[PDB]
mmCIF file of all heavy atoms in Angstrom:
data_model
loop_
_atom_site.group_PDB
_atom_site.id
_atom_site.type_symbol
_atom_site.label_atom_id
_atom_site.label_comp_id
_atom_site.label_asym_id
_atom_site.label_seq_id
_atom_site.Cartn_x
_atom_site.Cartn_y
_atom_site.Cartn_z
ATOM 1 N N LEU A 427 10.535 -5.959 -42.827
ATOM 2 C CA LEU A 427 10.047 -7.307 -42.800
ATOM 3 C C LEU A 427 9.253 -7.580 -44.031
ATOM 4 O O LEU A 427 8.400 -6.792 -44.440
ATOM 5 C CB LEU A 427 9.104 -7.606 -41.619
ATOM 6 C CG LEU A 427 9.737 -7.424 -40.232
ATOM 7 C CD1 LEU A 427 8.717 -7.759 -39.135
ATOM 8 C CD2 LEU A 427 11.056 -8.201 -40.096
ATOM 9 N N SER A 428 9.556 -8.731 -44.660
ATOM 10 C CA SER A 428 8.885 -9.189 -45.835
ATOM 11 C C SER A 428 7.653 -9.892 -45.374
ATOM 12 O O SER A 428 7.460 -10.107 -44.178
ATOM 13 C CB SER A 428 9.713 -10.202 -46.637
ATOM 14 O OG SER A 428 9.950 -11.361 -45.849
ATOM 15 N N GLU A 429 6.771 -10.248 -46.317
ATOM 16 C CA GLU A 429 5.571 -10.939 -45.948
ATOM 17 C C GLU A 429 5.964 -12.274 -45.404
ATOM 18 O O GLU A 429 5.400 -12.746 -44.416
ATOM 19 C CB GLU A 429 4.622 -11.190 -47.129
ATOM 20 C CG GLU A 429 3.956 -9.920 -47.665
ATOM 21 C CD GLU A 429 3.049 -10.318 -48.823
ATOM 22 O OE1 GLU A 429 3.540 -11.007 -49.751
ATOM 23 O OE2 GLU A 429 1.846 -9.946 -48.785
ATOM 24 N N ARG A 430 6.962 -12.924 -46.028
ATOM 25 C CA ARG A 430 7.317 -14.232 -45.573
ATOM 26 C C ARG A 430 7.798 -14.131 -44.169
ATOM 27 O O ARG A 430 7.399 -14.911 -43.303
ATOM 28 C CB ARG A 430 8.442 -14.878 -46.402
ATOM 29 C CG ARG A 430 8.011 -15.234 -47.827
ATOM 30 C CD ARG A 430 9.115 -15.881 -48.662
ATOM 31 N NE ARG A 430 10.197 -14.865 -48.829
ATOM 32 C CZ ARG A 430 10.118 -13.946 -49.835
ATOM 33 N NH1 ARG A 430 9.031 -13.937 -50.662
ATOM 34 N NH2 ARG A 430 11.117 -13.036 -50.016
ATOM 35 N N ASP A 431 8.656 -13.140 -43.913
ATOM 36 C CA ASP A 431 9.232 -12.941 -42.619
ATOM 37 C C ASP A 431 8.143 -12.653 -41.636
ATOM 38 O O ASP A 431 8.092 -13.247 -40.559
ATOM 39 C CB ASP A 431 10.205 -11.747 -42.688
ATOM 40 C CG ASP A 431 10.653 -11.328 -41.309
ATOM 41 O OD1 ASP A 431 9.804 -10.780 -40.552
ATOM 42 O OD2 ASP A 431 11.856 -11.522 -40.998
ATOM 43 N N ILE A 432 7.225 -11.736 -41.991
ATOM 44 C CA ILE A 432 6.177 -11.365 -41.082
ATOM 45 C C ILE A 432 5.299 -12.541 -40.841
ATOM 46 O O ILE A 432 4.851 -12.766 -39.714
ATOM 47 C CB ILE A 432 5.321 -10.218 -41.548
ATOM 48 C CG1 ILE A 432 4.246 -9.926 -40.483
ATOM 49 C CG2 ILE A 432 4.731 -10.557 -42.921
ATOM 50 C CD1 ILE A 432 4.819 -9.521 -39.128
ATOM 51 N N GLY A 433 5.039 -13.343 -41.887
ATOM 52 C CA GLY A 433 4.132 -14.444 -41.739
ATOM 53 C C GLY A 433 4.644 -15.337 -40.655
ATOM 54 O O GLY A 433 3.870 -15.847 -39.845
ATOM 55 N N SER A 434 5.970 -15.564 -40.615
ATOM 56 C CA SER A 434 6.513 -16.431 -39.612
ATOM 57 C C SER A 434 6.210 -15.833 -38.281
ATOM 58 O O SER A 434 5.792 -16.531 -37.351
ATOM 59 C CB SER A 434 8.044 -16.574 -39.714
ATOM 60 O OG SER A 434 8.519 -17.438 -38.697
ATOM 61 N N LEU A 435 6.393 -14.511 -38.160
ATOM 62 C CA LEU A 435 6.184 -13.826 -36.923
ATOM 63 C C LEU A 435 4.741 -13.950 -36.542
ATOM 64 O O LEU A 435 4.409 -14.143 -35.378
ATOM 65 C CB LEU A 435 6.513 -12.326 -37.017
ATOM 66 C CG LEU A 435 7.990 -12.043 -37.351
ATOM 67 C CD1 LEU A 435 8.264 -10.532 -37.429
ATOM 68 C CD2 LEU A 435 8.931 -12.775 -36.384
ATOM 69 N N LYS A 436 3.852 -13.842 -37.541
ATOM 70 C CA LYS A 436 2.443 -13.850 -37.274
ATOM 71 C C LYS A 436 2.086 -15.146 -36.609
ATOM 72 O O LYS A 436 1.391 -15.162 -35.597
ATOM 73 C CB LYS A 436 1.620 -13.731 -38.570
ATOM 74 C CG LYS A 436 0.145 -13.386 -38.358
ATOM 75 C CD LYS A 436 -0.630 -14.416 -37.541
ATOM 76 C CE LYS A 436 -2.106 -14.052 -37.360
ATOM 77 N NZ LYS A 436 -2.789 -15.091 -36.554
ATOM 78 N N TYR A 437 2.572 -16.267 -37.166
ATOM 79 C CA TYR A 437 2.258 -17.570 -36.649
ATOM 80 C C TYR A 437 2.896 -17.758 -35.307
ATOM 81 O O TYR A 437 2.269 -18.260 -34.373
ATOM 82 C CB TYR A 437 2.756 -18.700 -37.562
ATOM 83 C CG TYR A 437 1.869 -18.800 -38.780
ATOM 84 C CD1 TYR A 437 2.319 -18.319 -40.015
ATOM 85 C CD2 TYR A 437 0.597 -19.374 -38.675
ATOM 86 C CE1 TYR A 437 1.497 -18.411 -41.145
ATOM 87 C CE2 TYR A 437 -0.225 -19.467 -39.804
ATOM 88 C CZ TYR A 437 0.224 -18.986 -41.039
ATOM 89 O OH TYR A 437 -0.574 -19.075 -42.136
ATOM 90 N N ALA A 438 4.166 -17.328 -35.163
ATOM 91 C CA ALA A 438 4.909 -17.577 -33.960
ATOM 92 C C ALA A 438 4.228 -16.938 -32.795
ATOM 93 O O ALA A 438 4.109 -17.544 -31.735
ATOM 94 C CB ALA A 438 6.342 -17.020 -34.020
ATOM 95 N N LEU A 439 3.761 -15.689 -32.962
ATOM 96 C CA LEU A 439 3.128 -15.025 -31.861
ATOM 97 C C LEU A 439 1.895 -15.784 -31.516
ATOM 98 O O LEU A 439 1.583 -15.976 -30.340
ATOM 99 C CB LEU A 439 2.698 -13.586 -32.192
ATOM 100 C CG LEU A 439 3.876 -12.647 -32.499
ATOM 101 C CD1 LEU A 439 3.392 -11.215 -32.760
ATOM 102 C CD2 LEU A 439 4.958 -12.722 -31.405
ATOM 103 N N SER A 440 1.168 -16.259 -32.542
ATOM 104 C CA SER A 440 -0.057 -16.951 -32.281
ATOM 105 C C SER A 440 0.257 -18.125 -31.423
ATOM 106 O O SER A 440 -0.409 -18.370 -30.422
ATOM 107 C CB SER A 440 -0.735 -17.468 -33.561
ATOM 108 O OG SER A 440 -1.131 -16.370 -34.373
ATOM 109 N N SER A 441 1.309 -18.882 -31.791
ATOM 110 C CA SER A 441 1.689 -20.031 -31.032
ATOM 111 C C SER A 441 2.191 -19.590 -29.691
ATOM 112 O O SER A 441 2.001 -20.284 -28.694
ATOM 113 C CB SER A 441 2.749 -20.883 -31.755
ATOM 114 O OG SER A 441 3.821 -20.064 -32.204
ATOM 115 N N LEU A 442 2.823 -18.402 -29.623
ATOM 116 C CA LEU A 442 3.351 -17.908 -28.380
ATOM 117 C C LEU A 442 2.203 -17.764 -27.437
ATOM 118 O O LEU A 442 2.278 -18.165 -26.276
ATOM 119 C CB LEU A 442 3.915 -16.482 -28.484
ATOM 120 C CG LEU A 442 5.167 -16.299 -29.359
ATOM 121 C CD1 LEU A 442 5.605 -14.822 -29.359
ATOM 122 C CD2 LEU A 442 6.300 -17.235 -28.921
ATOM 123 N N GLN A 443 1.095 -17.198 -27.945
ATOM 124 C CA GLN A 443 -0.044 -16.913 -27.125
ATOM 125 C C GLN A 443 -0.536 -18.204 -26.568
ATOM 126 O O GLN A 443 -0.928 -18.283 -25.406
ATOM 127 C CB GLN A 443 -1.204 -16.312 -27.939
ATOM 128 C CG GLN A 443 -0.877 -14.960 -28.578
ATOM 129 C CD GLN A 443 -2.050 -14.586 -29.469
ATOM 130 O OE1 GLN A 443 -2.455 -15.360 -30.334
ATOM 131 N NE2 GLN A 443 -2.611 -13.365 -29.257
ATOM 132 N N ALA A 444 -0.519 -19.256 -27.400
ATOM 133 C CA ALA A 444 -1.024 -20.536 -27.011
ATOM 134 C C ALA A 444 -0.225 -21.073 -25.860
ATOM 135 O O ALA A 444 -0.791 -21.655 -24.936
ATOM 136 C CB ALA A 444 -0.951 -21.571 -28.140
ATOM 137 N N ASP A 445 1.110 -20.882 -25.878
ATOM 138 C CA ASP A 445 1.961 -21.474 -24.884
ATOM 139 C C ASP A 445 1.487 -21.118 -23.510
ATOM 140 O O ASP A 445 1.566 -19.974 -23.073
ATOM 141 C CB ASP A 445 3.435 -21.036 -24.999
ATOM 142 C CG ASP A 445 4.266 -21.924 -24.079
ATOM 143 O OD1 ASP A 445 3.668 -22.777 -23.378
ATOM 144 O OD2 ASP A 445 5.517 -21.750 -24.072
ATOM 145 N N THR A 446 0.949 -22.138 -22.807
ATOM 146 C CA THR A 446 0.475 -22.047 -21.457
ATOM 147 C C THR A 446 1.639 -21.956 -20.518
ATOM 148 O O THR A 446 1.570 -21.281 -19.489
ATOM 149 C CB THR A 446 -0.328 -23.247 -21.044
ATOM 150 O OG1 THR A 446 0.482 -24.412 -21.091
ATOM 151 C CG2 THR A 446 -1.520 -23.391 -22.004
ATOM 152 N N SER A 447 2.749 -22.627 -20.867
ATOM 153 C CA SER A 447 3.874 -22.757 -19.988
ATOM 154 C C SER A 447 4.362 -21.413 -19.555
ATOM 155 O O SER A 447 3.952 -20.375 -20.073
ATOM 156 C CB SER A 447 5.065 -23.509 -20.605
ATOM 157 O OG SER A 447 5.613 -22.756 -21.683
ATOM 158 N N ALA A 448 5.258 -21.429 -18.551
ATOM 159 C CA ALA A 448 5.829 -20.253 -17.957
ATOM 160 C C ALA A 448 6.560 -19.519 -19.033
ATOM 161 O O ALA A 448 6.565 -18.296 -19.072
ATOM 162 C CB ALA A 448 6.832 -20.574 -16.840
ATOM 163 N N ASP A 449 7.207 -20.272 -19.935
ATOM 164 C CA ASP A 449 7.931 -19.666 -21.013
ATOM 165 C C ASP A 449 6.942 -18.933 -21.852
ATOM 166 O O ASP A 449 7.272 -17.940 -22.499
ATOM 167 C CB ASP A 449 8.634 -20.699 -21.908
ATOM 168 C CG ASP A 449 9.810 -21.274 -21.141
ATOM 169 O OD1 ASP A 449 10.210 -20.652 -20.116
ATOM 170 O OD2 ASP A 449 10.336 -22.336 -21.563
ATOM 171 N N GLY A 450 5.677 -19.400 -21.843
ATOM 172 C CA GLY A 450 4.650 -18.856 -22.685
ATOM 173 C C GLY A 450 4.487 -17.391 -22.432
ATOM 174 O O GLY A 450 4.984 -16.841 -21.450
ATOM 175 N N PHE A 451 3.764 -16.735 -23.365
ATOM 176 C CA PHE A 451 3.535 -15.321 -23.439
ATOM 177 C C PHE A 451 2.785 -14.808 -22.251
ATOM 178 O O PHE A 451 3.122 -13.750 -21.720
ATOM 179 C CB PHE A 451 2.733 -14.924 -24.692
ATOM 180 C CG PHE A 451 2.555 -13.446 -24.681
ATOM 181 C CD1 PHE A 451 3.540 -12.616 -25.156
ATOM 182 C CD2 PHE A 451 1.394 -12.889 -24.191
ATOM 183 C CE1 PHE A 451 3.371 -11.249 -25.145
ATOM 184 C CE2 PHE A 451 1.223 -11.523 -24.182
ATOM 185 C CZ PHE A 451 2.213 -10.701 -24.656
ATOM 186 N N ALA A 452 1.730 -15.510 -21.805
ATOM 187 C CA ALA A 452 0.985 -14.969 -20.709
ATOM 188 C C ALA A 452 1.899 -14.860 -19.535
ATOM 189 O O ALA A 452 1.947 -13.836 -18.856
ATOM 190 C CB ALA A 452 -0.199 -15.857 -20.291
ATOM 191 N N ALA A 453 2.679 -15.929 -19.285
ATOM 192 C CA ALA A 453 3.595 -15.947 -18.185
ATOM 193 C C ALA A 453 4.681 -14.942 -18.413
ATOM 194 O O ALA A 453 5.092 -14.244 -17.488
ATOM 195 C CB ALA A 453 4.246 -17.321 -17.980
ATOM 196 N N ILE A 454 5.170 -14.833 -19.662
ATOM 197 C CA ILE A 454 6.294 -13.985 -19.945
ATOM 198 C C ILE A 454 5.948 -12.558 -19.643
ATOM 199 O O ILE A 454 6.788 -11.799 -19.168
ATOM 200 C CB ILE A 454 6.798 -14.079 -21.362
ATOM 201 C CG1 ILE A 454 8.199 -13.453 -21.466
ATOM 202 C CG2 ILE A 454 5.772 -13.432 -22.301
ATOM 203 C CD1 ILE A 454 8.905 -13.774 -22.785
ATOM 204 N N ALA A 455 4.698 -12.152 -19.925
ATOM 205 C CA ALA A 455 4.284 -10.785 -19.740
ATOM 206 C C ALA A 455 4.392 -10.378 -18.299
ATOM 207 O O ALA A 455 4.824 -9.266 -17.997
ATOM 208 C CB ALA A 455 2.826 -10.544 -20.167
ATOM 209 N N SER A 456 4.037 -11.277 -17.366
ATOM 210 C CA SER A 456 3.973 -10.937 -15.972
ATOM 211 C C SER A 456 5.326 -10.526 -15.481
ATOM 212 O O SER A 456 5.435 -9.842 -14.465
ATOM 213 C CB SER A 456 3.490 -12.111 -15.103
ATOM 214 O OG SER A 456 3.449 -11.714 -13.742
ATOM 215 N N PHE A 457 6.390 -10.904 -16.199
ATOM 216 C CA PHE A 457 7.706 -10.573 -15.741
ATOM 217 C C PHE A 457 7.826 -9.086 -15.642
ATOM 218 O O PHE A 457 8.385 -8.567 -14.679
ATOM 219 C CB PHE A 457 8.817 -11.071 -16.681
ATOM 220 C CG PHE A 457 8.890 -12.556 -16.574
ATOM 221 C CD1 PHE A 457 8.025 -13.360 -17.282
ATOM 222 C CD2 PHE A 457 9.826 -13.153 -15.761
ATOM 223 C CE1 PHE A 457 8.093 -14.731 -17.181
ATOM 224 C CE2 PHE A 457 9.899 -14.521 -15.656
ATOM 225 C CZ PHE A 457 9.029 -15.315 -16.367
ATOM 226 N N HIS A 458 7.300 -8.345 -16.632
ATOM 227 C CA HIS A 458 7.457 -6.918 -16.628
ATOM 228 C C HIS A 458 6.791 -6.305 -15.437
ATOM 229 O O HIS A 458 7.392 -5.473 -14.757
ATOM 230 C CB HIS A 458 6.858 -6.245 -17.874
ATOM 231 C CG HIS A 458 7.133 -4.772 -17.925
ATOM 232 N ND1 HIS A 458 6.367 -3.826 -17.282
ATOM 233 C CD2 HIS A 458 8.119 -4.088 -18.562
ATOM 234 C CE1 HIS A 458 6.929 -2.617 -17.559
ATOM 235 N NE2 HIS A 458 7.993 -2.724 -18.330
ATOM 236 N N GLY A 459 5.544 -6.706 -15.122
ATOM 237 C CA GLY A 459 4.873 -6.026 -14.051
ATOM 238 C C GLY A 459 3.849 -6.936 -13.468
ATOM 239 O O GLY A 459 4.135 -8.089 -13.169
ATOM 240 N N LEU A 460 2.619 -6.413 -13.286
ATOM 241 C CA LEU A 460 1.551 -7.143 -12.672
ATOM 242 C C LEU A 460 1.301 -8.361 -13.502
ATOM 243 O O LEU A 460 1.347 -8.319 -14.728
ATOM 244 C CB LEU A 460 0.260 -6.292 -12.597
ATOM 245 C CG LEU A 460 -0.975 -6.937 -11.936
ATOM 246 C CD1 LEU A 460 -1.545 -8.094 -12.776
ATOM 247 C CD2 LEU A 460 -0.709 -7.315 -10.472
ATOM 248 N N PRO A 461 1.081 -9.471 -12.840
ATOM 249 C CA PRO A 461 1.106 -9.498 -11.400
ATOM 250 C C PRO A 461 2.527 -9.447 -10.936
ATOM 251 O O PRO A 461 3.391 -9.960 -11.644
ATOM 252 C CB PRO A 461 0.396 -10.783 -10.983
ATOM 253 C CG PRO A 461 -0.531 -11.091 -12.172
ATOM 254 C CD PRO A 461 0.202 -10.491 -13.384
ATOM 255 N N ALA A 462 2.794 -8.887 -9.736
ATOM 256 C CA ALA A 462 4.160 -8.733 -9.319
ATOM 257 C C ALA A 462 4.634 -9.928 -8.542
ATOM 258 O O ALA A 462 4.229 -10.147 -7.401
ATOM 259 C CB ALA A 462 4.369 -7.504 -8.420
ATOM 260 N N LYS A 463 5.449 -10.772 -9.206
ATOM 261 C CA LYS A 463 6.148 -11.919 -8.687
ATOM 262 C C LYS A 463 7.511 -11.572 -8.145
ATOM 263 O O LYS A 463 8.176 -12.386 -7.501
ATOM 264 C CB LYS A 463 6.303 -13.062 -9.702
ATOM 265 C CG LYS A 463 6.710 -14.362 -9.012
ATOM 266 C CD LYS A 463 6.406 -15.621 -9.824
ATOM 267 C CE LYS A 463 6.630 -16.912 -9.033
ATOM 268 N NZ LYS A 463 5.571 -17.082 -8.020
ATOM 269 N N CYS A 464 7.968 -10.345 -8.435
ATOM 270 C CA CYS A 464 9.327 -9.875 -8.391
ATOM 271 C C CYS A 464 10.100 -10.144 -7.134
ATOM 272 O O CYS A 464 11.113 -10.835 -7.206
ATOM 273 C CB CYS A 464 9.258 -8.381 -8.646
ATOM 274 S SG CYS A 464 7.819 -8.223 -9.733
ATOM 275 N N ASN A 465 9.697 -9.639 -5.955
ATOM 276 C CA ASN A 465 10.548 -9.956 -4.841
ATOM 277 C C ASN A 465 10.463 -11.428 -4.610
ATOM 278 O O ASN A 465 11.478 -12.107 -4.449
ATOM 279 C CB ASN A 465 10.253 -9.123 -3.576
ATOM 280 C CG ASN A 465 8.774 -9.124 -3.241
ATOM 281 O OD1 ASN A 465 7.957 -9.787 -3.882
ATOM 282 N ND2 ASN A 465 8.411 -8.316 -2.214
ATOM 283 N N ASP A 466 9.233 -11.947 -4.628
ATOM 284 C CA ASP A 466 8.976 -13.353 -4.521
ATOM 285 C C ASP A 466 7.521 -13.469 -4.816
ATOM 286 O O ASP A 466 6.861 -12.476 -5.127
ATOM 287 C CB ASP A 466 9.228 -13.938 -3.122
ATOM 288 C CG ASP A 466 9.252 -15.459 -3.220
ATOM 289 O OD1 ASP A 466 9.226 -15.991 -4.363
ATOM 290 O OD2 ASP A 466 9.301 -16.112 -2.145
ATOM 291 N N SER A 467 6.985 -14.697 -4.765
ATOM 292 C CA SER A 467 5.584 -14.886 -4.993
ATOM 293 C C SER A 467 4.848 -14.313 -3.820
ATOM 294 O O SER A 467 3.644 -14.095 -3.884
ATOM 295 C CB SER A 467 5.188 -16.362 -5.098
ATOM 296 O OG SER A 467 3.793 -16.468 -5.323
ATOM 297 N N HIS A 468 5.575 -14.033 -2.723
ATOM 298 C CA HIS A 468 4.926 -13.590 -1.520
ATOM 299 C C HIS A 468 4.140 -12.348 -1.778
ATOM 300 O O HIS A 468 4.356 -11.638 -2.759
ATOM 301 C CB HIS A 468 5.859 -13.372 -0.312
ATOM 302 C CG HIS A 468 6.823 -12.235 -0.455
ATOM 303 N ND1 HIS A 468 8.054 -12.339 -1.058
ATOM 304 C CD2 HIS A 468 6.725 -10.951 -0.019
ATOM 305 C CE1 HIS A 468 8.641 -11.118 -0.961
ATOM 306 N NE2 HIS A 468 7.872 -10.245 -0.336
#
């Protein structure tokens, strides 16, 4: 990765973090594990 390339990544992640939406990073992380939504929200 070049600086230009990384720079884009740097900003994107920052914006990713910002994304409150489900698509957003905080939400995206939960997919892997805790909190466990997996079988259902139940």
Side-chain angles (χ1 to χ4, degrees):
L427 299 180
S428 62
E429 290 180 308
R430 291 180 296 275
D431 170 290
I432 180 61
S434 180
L435 298 180
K436 194 299 181 180
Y437 285 105
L439 296 182
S440 295
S441 50
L442 294 180
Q443 297 173 306
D445 191 357
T446 62
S447 66
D449 288 344
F451 180 83
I454 195 167
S456 180
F457 289 82
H458 185 276
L460 181 292
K463 195 159 188 72
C464 329
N465 49 4
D466 194 8
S467 180
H468 67 274

